[PDB]
Amino acid sequence: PKDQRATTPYMTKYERARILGTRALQISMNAPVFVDLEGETDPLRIAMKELAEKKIPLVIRRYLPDGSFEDWSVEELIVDL
Amino acid sequence: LEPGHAADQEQAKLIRSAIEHTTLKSVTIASEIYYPDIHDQQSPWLLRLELDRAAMNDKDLTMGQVGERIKQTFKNDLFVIWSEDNDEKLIIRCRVVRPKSLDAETEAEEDHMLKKIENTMLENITLRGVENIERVVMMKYDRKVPSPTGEYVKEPEWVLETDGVNLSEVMTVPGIDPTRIYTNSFIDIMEVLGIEAGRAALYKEVYNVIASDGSYVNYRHMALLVDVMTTQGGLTSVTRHGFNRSNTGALM
Amino acid sequence: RLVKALEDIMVHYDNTTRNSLGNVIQFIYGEDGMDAAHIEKQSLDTIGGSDAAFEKRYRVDLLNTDHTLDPSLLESGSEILGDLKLQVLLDEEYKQLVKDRKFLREVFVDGEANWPLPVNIRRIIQNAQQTFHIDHTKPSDLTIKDIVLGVKDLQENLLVLRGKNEIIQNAQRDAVTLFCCLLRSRLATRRVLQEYRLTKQAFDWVLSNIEAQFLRSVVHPGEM
Amino acid sequence: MDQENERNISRLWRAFRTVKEMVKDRGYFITQEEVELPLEDFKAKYCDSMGRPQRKMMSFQANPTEESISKFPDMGSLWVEFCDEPSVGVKTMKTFVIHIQEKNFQTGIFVYQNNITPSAMKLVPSIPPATIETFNEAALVVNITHHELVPKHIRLSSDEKRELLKRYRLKESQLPRIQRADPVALYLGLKRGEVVKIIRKSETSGRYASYRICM
RNA sequence: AUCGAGAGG
DNA sequence: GGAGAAGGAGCAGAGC
DNA sequence: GCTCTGCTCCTTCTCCTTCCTCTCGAT
């Protein structure tokens, strides 16, 4: 369902790690960067900037024990940590 | 001990006598069969049992007390007469009872019968106490007790540390607080109280092992372990007869 | 053997610990739902002490001089004097704190007050005392109503589970019982007004800080 | 023990009390003073003038409380009886069974004096839908649910069970299990498929509820 | 390529 | 080394 | 009353394993 999502609104350290990894990979594959490259050449550092600015174009499918799932977007998730 | 007797070592002694298992053998010196012995029920055989007075004094046993137990186990099949507690030799004399012949005669009975009596006696007369319970150590232990002021004050109480486990009988002993009794056996505490008690005890013992060397592991980790071992309503070991005997993926 | 036996035990996104089969091991991971790495040993002040000492440290009575707050503690401390409406809130607070003693005495029968709980509140308070330059010679702008309700609001906003079903809501109430006992015992009216003489700004900051850290202590899903 | 050695009688008395507590916990209308019967009163009411606990007189009928009924609509009447004969033979087991059949009791408890033969044991589950539970007087001397290691067990209704499984997206097989032979399960008289809510005190949180299903 | 032996951590 | 699994054996009851 | 039909109550048997790393020296 769209609403009634029972999982946390915060981004977990595992979600953050994979988001940065997969985005950094795309960057290293010469994908378009959605933030200004302020002297940044390191895919990971670049990805972290996008994370801070919530520019990372991804959605986390959180699978629940019974096979069902809740889709949360990067923008929705609270990148605290 | 029952709260009210927490500071009563005499009650502790009474309980120790009630629990500390005593087999006749343990308080005897020697046994002889004879064909200046002290009063159907009469044979020419004189089973002479010499008791250890010092041991009986230690165990608070009287010959009358022992005799009543003997009569209970042999009923009227064995004729028994006891010497006095003030006698130097605490002699118990037994004769074979047999209305089938001894009714009007002193016929010699089979020695094998006496041998059976000897073993049936010496090795099985449970004079007193709970089966399988051996040593019973009486000692004071300290414990904080919320005083009348509301503040915890450390108090001392007598606790009986026994050697062996038999909850099925110990729990019913008068003068004992059945809710505080604790063992080391997971299987027995489980079978007696239930899987939740077993699991709880399981944790406590795991804790004791780790804590025994001064180290510390977070409750959360130990709790997880014992919870897993008790999800099936029993005690699942970490062996191939525990873990491997599951419904989990074959490749695992 | 231990690693193999527990190889597949994981915290799922429902905050429940399960194995490969999906069998529930713990409905709430660790019986609290929090990561051991974020746990610190703290003192549950209300467990110990005499009942009289407790009363002296936690009972506030604006109707009797025996426990009426010293006016100078507050900018309006002379106005709260005789204020029955605030006394009602104070009675609510104290009553709960009395209940807390009953409860914790049942939970920890050995009287031990030092236990591993998430969020070192004591240290948080010290940060406020220093950060806002808490001048302990000046009357504060705290309101008894604001303190009582402020703490209660914090408790409501702690969260761990986020379902709506009474089953989950009940579990939520139980999951944070000790932490809430800690909050209530640590942030009582006298504790806040006499021991930790914070300003409204500092006090509010403490509450919001506790919330943030508490949420950070909750175990993440996917944790092995 | 001897009639003189009333200890035997007091053990019986204890068992009697624990049965009253059990029946009460099962949801039947047992009062507190009914449970709290003094030994000398037990003797006055049940023990023969010659110091002989009239075990037959210790039998009684229990009736589910209004609250128990509202939660468990199908909860019927309970007959409790203690065996007068040391060793339970089918001749007495059948007698007990017949009583239930004639009185149409939903369930009945039969307490062993000393032991029971297989000839009787096989009969105990021969009259569906009625259920006969059995206990040994020795086992009943102490009520194990008061032990420090035993937490409060709550037998859930079928509605509570259904909601539980739905809420956590669980299948019955994914709940923690308890064997029907488990002392406590026996105390509660759990039937296969029933779920018990267990409330424990903890060190990481004030208390923690856990669910366990009867196998 | 197996197989044993000697060690190191 | 200490399980567990398979097998022979020795008695309470029970039907003719 | 006496063998009979079951047991359940025992004794008497088969099975398994830190990590990791180096070298030589045989077949």
Curated annotation (Swiss-Prot), chain A:
GO molecular function annotation: DNA binding; DNA-directed RNA polymerase activity
Keyword Phosphoprotein: yes
Main localization (coarse): cytoplasm
Subcellular location: Cytoplasm; Nucleus
GO cellular component: cytoplasm; nucleoplasm; nucleus; RNA polymerase I complex; RNA polymerase II, core complex; RNA polymerase III complex
Region (Leucine-zipper): 37-58
Coiled-coil region list: none
Superkingdom as given in the UniProt entry: Eukaryota
Keywords: Cytoplasm, DNA-directed RNA polymerase, Nucleus, Phosphoprotein, Ribosome biogenesis, Transcription
GO biological process: nucleolar large rRNA transcription by RNA polymerase I; ribosome biogenesis; RNA-templated transcription; termination of RNA polymerase I transcription; termination of RNA polymerase III transcription; transcription by RNA polymerase I; transcription by RNA polymerase II; transcription by RNA polymerase III
First and last residue of the signal peptide: none
Function of the molecule: DNA-dependent RNA polymerases catalyze the transcription of DNA into RNA using the four ribonucleoside triphosphates as substrates. Common component of RNA polymerases I, II and III which synthesize ribosomal RNA precursors, mRNA precursors and many functional non-coding RNAs, and small RNAs, such as 5S rRNA and tRNAs, respectively. Pol II is the central component of the basal RNA polymerase II transcription machinery. RNA polymerases are composed of mobile elements that move relative to each other.
Assembly and binders: Component of the RNA polymerase I (Pol I), RNA polymerase II (Pol II) and RNA polymerase III (Pol III) complexes. Component of the RNA polymerase I (Pol I) complex consisting of 14 subunits: RPA135, RPA190, RPC40, RPA14, RPB5, RPO26, RPA43, RPB8, RPA12, RPB10, RPC19, RPC10, RPA49 and RPA34. The complex is composed of a horseshoe-shaped core containing ten subunits (RPA135, RPA190, RPB5, RPO26, RPB8, RPB10, RPC10, RPA12, RPC19 and RPC40) where RPA135 and RPA190 form the DNA-binding cleft.
Parent-protein start and end of this portion: 75 to 155 of 155
UniProtKB/Swiss-Prot annotation, chain C:
Superkingdom field: Eukaryota
Cell compartments where the protein resides: Nucleus
PTM: The tandem 7 residues repeats in the C-terminal domain (CTD) can be highly phosphorylated. The phosphorylation activates Pol II. Phosphorylation occurs mainly at residues 'Ser-2' and 'Ser-5' of the heptapeptide repeat. The phosphorylated form of Pol II appears to carry, on average, one phosphate per repeat. The phosphorylation state is believed to result from the balanced action of site-specific CTD kinases and phosphatases, and a 'CTD code' that specifies the position of Pol II within the transcription cycle has been proposed.
Role description: DNA-dependent RNA polymerase catalyzes the transcription of DNA into RNA using the four ribonucleoside triphosphates as substrates. Largest and catalytic component of RNA polymerase II which synthesizes mRNA precursors and many functional non-coding RNAs. Forms the polymerase active center together with the second largest subunit. Pol II is the central component of the basal RNA polymerase II transcription machinery. During a transcription cycle, Pol II, general transcription factors and the Mediator complex assemble as the preinitiation complex (PIC) at the promoter.
Known partners and oligomeric status: Component of the RNA polymerase II (Pol II) complex consisting of 12 subunits. Interacts with DEF1; the interaction is direct and serves to bridge RPB1 to the Elongin complex in a DNA-damaged dependent manner. Interacts with the Elongin subunit ELA1. Interacts with the Elongin subunit ELC1. Interacts with ASK10. Interacts with ESS1. Interacts with RTT103. Interacts with SHE2.
Annotated domain remarks: The C-terminal domain (CTD) serves as a platform for assembly of factors that regulate transcription initiation, elongation, termination and mRNA processing.
Gene name of this polypeptide: RPO21
Swiss-Prot record, chain D:
Molecular function GO terms recorded: DNA binding; DNA-directed RNA polymerase activity
Keywords, in A-Z order: DNA-binding, DNA-directed RNA polymerase, Nucleus, Ribosome biogenesis, Transcription
Record gene name: RPB5
One family name in Pfam for this protein: RNA_pol_Rpb5_N
Biological process, per Gene Ontology: nucleolar large rRNA transcription by RNA polymerase I; ribosome biogenesis; RNA-templated transcription; termination of RNA polymerase I transcription; termination of RNA polymerase III transcription; transcription by RNA polymerase I; transcription by RNA polymerase II; transcription by RNA polymerase III
Primary location class: nucleus
Assembly with partners or alone: Component of the RNA polymerase I (Pol I), RNA polymerase II (Pol II) and RNA polymerase III (Pol III) complexes. Component of the RNA polymerase I (Pol I) complex consisting of 14 subunits: RPA135, RPA190, RPC40, RPA14, RPB5, RPO26, RPA43, RPB8, RPA12, RPB10, RPC19, RPC10, RPA49 and RPA34. The complex is composed of a horseshoe-shaped core containing ten subunits (RPA135, RPA190, RPB5, RPO26, RPB8, RPB10, RPC10, RPA12, RPC19 and RPC40) where RPA135 and RPA190 form the DNA-binding cleft.
Presence of the UniProt keyword Transcription in the record: yes
InterPro entries recorded: Arch_Rpo5/euc_Rpb5, RNA_pol_Rpb5_N, RNA_pol_Rpb5_N_sf, RNA_pol_subH/Rpb5_C, RNA_pol_subH/Rpb5_CS, RPB5-like_sf
Entries under NCBIfam families matching the protein: PRK09570.1
GO cellular component, one term: RNA polymerase II, core complex
Compartments it resides in: Nucleus
Name of the protein in its database record: DNA-directed RNA polymerases I, II, and III subunit RPABC1
Xref: Gene3D superfamilies: RNA polymerase, Rpb5, N-terminal domain, RPB5-like RNA polymerase subunit
Lineage: Eukaryota, Fungi, Dikarya, Ascomycota, Saccharomycotina
